[PDB]
Design a protein around this ligand. Structure first.
Ligand code: CLA
Ligand code: CLA
Ligand code: CLA
Ligand code: CLA
Ligand code: CLA
Ligand code: CLA
Ligand code: CLA
Ligand code: CLA
Ligand SMILES: CCCCCCCCCCCCCCCC(=O)OC[C@H](COP(=O)(O)OC[C@@H](O)CO)OC(=O)CCCCCCCCCCCCCCC
Ligand SMILES: CC1=C(/C=C/C(C)=C/C=C\C(C)=C\C=C\C=C(C)\C=C\C=C(C)\C=C\C2=C(C)CCCC2(C)C)C(C)(C)CCC1
Ligand code: SF4
Lengths: 709, 56, 217, 41
């Protein structure tokens, strides 16, 4: 009839709760969708593993990791695009990759291209298996609802079996394959002369030569004489001098300990045999001193709703991803990763964006649960009611903190800028005039530096080299890691981070709390989770729904994450990364200008944005010209997004009316009447293009800058 | 060789004492799962004691 | 009837119609609730019976060549342990009138005919005696029970004319099948651990019982 | 089946087939007559 049906078709494709009201069918559809996603992931992994076997310089890089740039993509010479095949070294031409796949393969003991082919074939087989399993479990043997609600058995298996046994199996693989092959590689042995991994298993004296403890067999494990296994199960700490990563023996010991702990932890919840706790009993019986009655009623809420569980899991996964991003740059786990700067910058930025998106999703699905599944009559919970009964106090206090933080974090920058402009450099907040030192962080750094030898007797070195007191590490003439100083410039940016995080939290929490009703629209629950407005009455009620709160919070998440990656990039380029001469003098890439230039807004515009963007804008005619082309294209998308965000719907409907008249004049009028986009759709289109343009611009800028220098 | 050392006696006593504490078809309804759990707990306790004592 | 680790839940549905039912089901796999896929009591009983029959064949077949080889009944060239008769090429091979892969194809074809006919009888009863099959369709009609087809082809000696004798023979068959499956598992584990033939393991244990045990290995 | 033909005639699949054939053709001329600015005929 009209064109809005086409748009509505793709908008509700995965909303199973709207299609049917039966929990069993929703659960079955969710199971099959998960199977399909797993199949797609396996296909992606198969492609990645295959491409590195046929179209890569993996072997040449393996013979010389420092001086050869990794590559796994090659372009066809059709329209003159073969200029993208740069000289990456090793007698190979192609596109340099920054996903850190070569380091993973080297740390796993892979030495030839025959093993990658087998891995690719196995992954393809697994993808086919997952697709068939999804089809079978939806159409032939679909489980019942009572199967999905056995959350005591799901936790036991997902802790003991999935996580407990995976770590143990990986520790076994490491001990049996990764340690000896990496020891041979680190000894200067040519890769084609290293014995195959199965020779270590079949021939035992070969393993005994490298580690004498393997001659004793498995008897010391059973006799509790565990000190004999200290040859390959160490507690050293620090980085490997040869490669620049963590010792593989430490990783093996860590995985063994983690596996044992998870296996122990997986025997907690009660099952058919009557030993262990029940989750409902733990929730009900818990009554501390201020809760009073307790958490009575959360079991039904969390077992009869999919949106609450999705929100909780999304929040936890986002926080975990951010932690993973932070913990990998400071303690590099793979060989030849710290001194390869292109990959280090790319791995930190990827997971930050992923974590931010997942957190915003958690907020959105909490709002959806509040709008749809909330039921005070049948599923009453006390704590949620008390939180809903004083929501005015929560929001008003969170509103104040944002203003205070914003003033006391941005007015300092503005004051510095004004004092610099007026020729009064002695009145700025800097290391020379007025110092705001982060004393607590420095105390933490000193404590962590001094912890080995006093509070950690078994440790031979500190966990990381960022805490001041350690020694510089150099691999192949480049700087891998060294202590990171903290000063007045690091005091302001941390409070910028805090301010942005608090504002995002304010927006999302306000949306979630006022999803059901507010003082303006008492019946907002009946209008739905996703509705544009409630008319121009009461002065105007534009964007009152929770969907619009998530739409507003996406912008602030993007604003917050962008400052983090800029801070990381400039601080690492100016204070850590660099090169070392033969006599031991470190020359950083930008020569330590972060301390003095990063205290005014002019310093970020001139010393960071203007100075570091000269690489991308001069990439025309070289193998990096694709980054120069993507730099300009992303600006177009970002500026194109503004048409949907700034304008309304009536103007475009009238324009389409005139266009339809001109079409009717020539008997080319379609039977499907054209319609302008809805109010909600126009908002969704704008933010998508906005985020795409911004992220693509930053991506091209970073990748073109860091590969060249 | 190993039989009769300190480790053997220590963990034998640990397991037996844990089983006796757990107990105090079968007259008392001691399910096989209970026996497995009590033996396991005795084993972790004994391993932790032996490893700690072996250091000093 | 005797009960072996029986439980209240398992005793609810294992009445005793199946042959050799002892009430043993700690995991409750055969519970009539939530039946689907291949987890169905009828299919589970059928699978147990078929696995038992194949195990009773294999347990004697694997150890037969080693028994006669020591007694001189067969040439030493054919007195190989069960894992050196070409089943595992790395462990050793023997040269027959044809290589292993054409033997594999011939086995697959013949047993595909047999097993597909059996499966078609399982799905719908009595339909294997209707279509003309070289005039052999008269005896392959079955008897309505998938695991006990009967008939002239499968019961030529006319055993179990009475129901009591049939039940006793079924019980004995299932007991022998369970024992044979345990024996085959022992075969696999001994072959993987010791590295010699099972009859060699028994001879070594008999020669010096105090030495050739699990403890020394 | 009839449903196979009906699903194949829907707008997205038909449009994707048409555009793929078009792109292949255009690449064919661009490969056969590369670096072309004027008609020499
Ligand atoms: C999501 C995973 C993924 C992705 C993004 C790619 C992407 C790519 N593959 Mg590829 N591939 C994958 C999985 C993947 N592959 C898998 C699983 C296999 C089988 C193991 C292959 C086998 C494969 C071969 C054999 C070739 C590629 C090639 C290519 C490139 C050109 C594609 C093309 O012309 O398509 C055209 C459009 C089609 C629909 C086909 C492109 C970069 C080609 C290449 O790089 O040549 C230089 C090439 O020759 N791929
Ligand atoms: C699930 C993981 C796993 C698997 C499958 C194996 C498998 C094996 N290990 Mg083993 N092992 C593992 C984890 C594992 N191990 C761990 C975590 C440790 C550290 C304590 C060891 C320490 C170890 C030693 C010290 C020895 C084996 C040996 C062996 C082999 C003889 C049994 C066998 C292939 C033995 C071997 O090399 O036989 C050839 C041997 O001497 N393993
Ligand atoms: C495990 C992750 C997960 C899962 C299972 C879901 C599941 C769901 N979400 Mg959801 N969400 C998530 C994460 C997740 N979300 C995150 C992280 C966010 C934060 C951004 C959101 C934000 C969100 C909102 C705001 C809404 C949902 C909604 C929904 C429901 C309907 C979704 C739908 O119809 O999509 C249909 C699928 C699409 C529309 C496809 C989107 C296409 C993207 C935007 C463009 C990508 C461009 C691409 C890069 C270029 C391709 C080019 C090519 C086309 C040529 C469904 C239950 C909706 C809901 O419940 O309403 C009642 C809803 O309004 N989600
Ligand atoms: C075959 C169908 C068809 C035809 C004959 C026309 C004809 C016309 N359009 Mg038009 N248009 C079409 C489809 C068509 N349109 C579609 C699908 C859109 C949406 C994208 C538009 C959007 C559009 C706008 C916004 C405007 C016109 C205008 C015009 C007039 C100016 C001449 C011109 O080429 O404008 C340029 C036309 C375009 C740039 C449209 C793009 C061409 C599309 C992609 C072709 C699609 C063909 C389609 C797949 C047919 C399939 C056939 C198959 C079943 C066999 C002219 C009468 C202008 C006018 O005078 O005011 C009304 C004007 O401002 N059109
Ligand atoms: C006789 C009783 C006894 C004694 C003297 C010890 C003594 C010790 N235990 Mg210990 N332990 C015991 C019983 C005992 N344990 C029991 C019953 C368990 C439960 C299995 C544990 C579980 C345990 C763990 C998990 C750890 C210790 C550790 C330690 C050492 C402390 C190191 C530190 O400061 O941290 C110390 C030698 C720690 C250690 O060895 O670190 C070096 C350590 O991580 N113990
Ligand atoms: C091919 C192997 C096999 C199969 C399919 C069965 C199947 C069965 N047995 Mg059984 N059994 C077996 C071997 C097998 N058994 C062996 C070797 C013994 C000797 C210890 C027994 C001793 C035994 C007793 C004493 C009893 C049964 C009973 C049963 C029936 C109900 C129990 C049940 O749900 O089991 C379902 C079993 C399966 C779905 C497959 C077996 C478990 C798999 C292989 C998991 C792997 C376990 C481990 C890693 C090996 C069921 C038809 C009970 C009954 O009433 O019989 C009529 C009964 O009382 N069995
Ligand atoms: C997340 C994954 C997942 C989950 C939760 C389930 C869950 C379930 N499946 Mg299932 N399945 C899966 C994946 C999964 N499946 C895949 C990938 C396949 C392959 C297509 C199947 C094929 C399958 C069949 C054919 C059947 C089920 C059935 C069932 C149900 C009964 C299972 C049971 O009682 O245990 C039974 C468990 C056993 C008998 C033990 C089997 C042990 C296996 C053989 C060992 C696996 C070895 C592994 C490959 C080793 C890896 C080594 C390494 C080199 C990779 C249960 C709801 C059954 C049902 O009735 O559905 C309702 C049924 O008949 N599933
Ligand atoms: C008189 C006793 C006797 C003897 C001498 C043999 C001898 C042999 N059997 Mg055998 N077998 C026997 C009884 C016997 N079987 C019994 C009673 C059964 C069970 C019905 C089997 C089941 C059996 C199987 C299933 C297989 C053999 C196979 C073999 C051959 C493997 C050894 C070789 O090198 O070739 C060998 C000729 C194997 C072979 O390849 O046969 C040619 C084989 O796969 N046998
Ligand atoms: C006051 C400092 C936090 C005290 C504390 O324990 O916070 C949490 C606490 C609520 O705790 P619950 O009673 O939910 O749980 C107590 C636990 O011991 C057992 O669940 O709130 C208060 O006691 C007052 C909150 C005032 C508003 C705080 C805003 C921030
Ligand atoms: C009087 C009487 C009697 C008695 C008996 C008994 C009392 C026995 C017992 C026994 C037992 C009851 C045992 C148990 C055990 C168990 C276990 C033992 C399990 C498990 C464990 C584990 C698995 C562990 C592991 C580990 C490792 C490996 C490493 C780390 C550490 C640990 C330790 C954790 C009889 C019957 C004769 C007769 C009648 C009368
Ligand atoms: S028509 Fe537009 S501006 Fe007016 S209330 Fe609705 S959404 Fe707001």
């Amino acid at each position: 009839d009209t064109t809005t049906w086409i748009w509505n078709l793709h908008a509700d494709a995965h909303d199973f709760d709207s299609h049917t009201s039966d929990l069993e069918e929703i659960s079955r559809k969710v199971f099959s969708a998960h199977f399909g996603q797993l199949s797609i992931i396996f296909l992606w992994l198969s492609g990645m593993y295959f491409h590195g076997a046929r179209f890569s310089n993996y072997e040449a890089w393996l013979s010389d990791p420092t001086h050869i740039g990794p590559s796994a993509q090659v372009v066809w010479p059709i329209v003159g695009q073969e200029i993208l095949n740069g000289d990456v070294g090793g007698g190979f031409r192609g596109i340099q990759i920054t996903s850190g796949f070569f380091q993973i393969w080297r740390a796993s003991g892979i030495t030839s291209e025959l093993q990658l082919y087998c891995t690719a074939i196995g992954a393809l087989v697994f993808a086919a298996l997952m697709l068939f399993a999804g089809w079978f479990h939806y159409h032939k043997a679909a489980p019942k609802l009572a199967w999905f609600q056995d959350v005591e058995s799901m936790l036991n298996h997902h802790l003991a079996g999935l996580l407990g046994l995976g770590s143990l199996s990986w520790a076994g693989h490491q001990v049996h394959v990764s340690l000896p092959i990496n020891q041979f590689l680190n000894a200067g042995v040519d890769p084609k002369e290293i014995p195959l991994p199965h020779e270590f298993i079949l021939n035992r004296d070969l393993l005994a030569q490298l580690y004498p403890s393997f001659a004793e067999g498995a008897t010391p494990f059973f006799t509790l004489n565990w000190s004999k296994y200290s040859e390959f199960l160490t507690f050293r700490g620090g980085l490997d001098p040869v490669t620049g990563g963590l010792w593989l023996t430490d990783i093996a010991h860590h995985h063994l300990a983690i596996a044992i702990l998870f296996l122990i932890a997986g025997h907690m919840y009660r099952t058919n045999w009557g030993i262990g706790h029940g989750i409902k009993d733990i929730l009900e019986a818990h009554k501390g001193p201020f809760t009073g009655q307790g958490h009575k009623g959360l079991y039904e809420i969390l077992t009869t709703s999919w949106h609450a569980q999705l929100s909780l899991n999304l929040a936890m996964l986002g926080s975990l991803t951010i932690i993973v991003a932070h913990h990998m740059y400071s303690m590099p786990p793979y060989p030849y990763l710290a001194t390869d700067y292109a990959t280090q910058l790319s791995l930190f930025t990827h997971h930050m964006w992923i974590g931010g998106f997942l957190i915003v999703g958690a907020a959105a699905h909490a709002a959806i649960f509040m709008v749809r599944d909330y039921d005070p009559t049948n599923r009453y919970n006390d704590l949620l009611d008390r939180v809903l009964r004083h929501r005015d106090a929560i929001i008003s206090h969170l509103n104040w903190v944002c203003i205070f933080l914003g003033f006391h974090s941005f007015g300092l920058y503005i004051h510095n800028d004004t004092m610099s402009a007026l020729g009064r450099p002695q009145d700025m907040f800097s290391d020379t005039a007025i110092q705001l030192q982060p004393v607590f962080a420095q105390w933490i750094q000193n404590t962590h530096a001094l912890a080995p030898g006093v509070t950690a007797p078994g440790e031979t070195a500190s966990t990381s080299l960022t805490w001041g007191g350690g020694e510089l590490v150099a691999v192949g003439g480049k700087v891998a890691l060294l202590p990171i100083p903290l000063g007045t410039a690091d005091f302001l940016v941390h409070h910028i981070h805090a301010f942005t995080i608090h504002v995002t939290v304010l927006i999302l929490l306000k949306g979630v709390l006022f999803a059901r009703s507010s003082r303006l629209i008492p019946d907002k629950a009946n209008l739905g989770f996703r509705f544009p407005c409630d008319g121009p009455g009461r002065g105007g009620t534009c964007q009152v729904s929770a969907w619009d709160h998530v739409f507003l919070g996406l912008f602030w998440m993007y604003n917050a994450i962008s400052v983090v990656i800029f801070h990381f990039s400039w601080k690492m380029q100016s204070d850590v990364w660099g090169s070392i001469s033969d006599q031991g003098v470190v020359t950083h890439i930008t020569g330590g200008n972060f301390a003095q230039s990063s205290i005014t807004i002019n310093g970020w515009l001139r010393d960071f944005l203007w100075a570091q963007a000269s690489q991308v804008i001069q990439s025309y005619g070289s193998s990096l010209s694709a980054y120069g082309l993507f730099f300009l294209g992303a600006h177009f998308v970002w500026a194109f997004s503004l048409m949907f965000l700034f304008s309304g719907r009536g103007y475009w409907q009238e324009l389409i009316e005139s266009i339809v008249w001109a079409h009717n004049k020539l008997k080319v009028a379609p039977a499907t009447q054209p319609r302008a986009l809805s109010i909600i759709q126009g908002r969704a289109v704008g933010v998508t293009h906005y985020l795409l343009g911004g992220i693509a611009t930053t991506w091209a800028f970073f990748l073109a800058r860091i590969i060249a220098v | 060789d190993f039989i009769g050392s300190s480790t053997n006696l220590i963990m034998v006593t640990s397991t037996t004492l844990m089983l006796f504490a757990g107990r105090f078809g079968d007259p008392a309804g001691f399910t096989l799962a209970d026996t497995l759990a009590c033996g396991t707990v005795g084993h972790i306790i004994g391993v932790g004691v032996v490893l700690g004592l072996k250091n000093i | 009837r005797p009960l072996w680790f029986a439980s209240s839940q398992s005793l609810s549905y294992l009445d005793g119609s199946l042959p050799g039912d002892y009430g043993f089901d700690p995991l409750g796999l055969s519970d009539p609730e939530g039946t689907g896929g291949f987890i169905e009591p009828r299919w589970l009983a059928y699978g147990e019976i078929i696995n038992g029959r194949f195990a009773m064949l294999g347990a004697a077949g694997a150890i037969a060549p080693e028994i006669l080889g020591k007694a001189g009944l067969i040439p030493a060239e054919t007195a190989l342990p069960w894992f050196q008769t070409g089943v595992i090429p790395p462990a050793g091979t023997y040269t027959y009138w044809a290589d292993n892969y054409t033997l594999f194809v011939l086995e697959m074809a013949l047993m595909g005919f047999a097993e597909h006919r059996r499966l078609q009888d399982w799905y719908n009863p009595g339909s294997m005696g209707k279509q003309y099959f070289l005039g052999l369709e008269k005896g392959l009609a079955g008897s309505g029970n998938p695991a006990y087809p009967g008939g002239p082809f499968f019961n030529p000696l006319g055993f179990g004319k009475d129901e009591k004798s049939l039940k006793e023979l079924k019980l004995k068959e299932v007991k022998n099948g369970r024992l044979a499956m345990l024996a085959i598992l022992g075969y696999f584990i001994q072959g993987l651990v010791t590295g010699v033939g099972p009859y060699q393991n028994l001879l070594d244990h008999l020669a010096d019982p105090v030495n050739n045990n699990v403890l020394t290995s | 089946m009839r449903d196979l033909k009906t699903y194949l005639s829907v707008a997205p699949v038909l449009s994707t087939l048409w555009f793929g054939s078009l792109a292949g053709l255009l690449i064919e001329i661009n490969r056969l007559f590369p670096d072309a600015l004027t008609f020499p005929f």
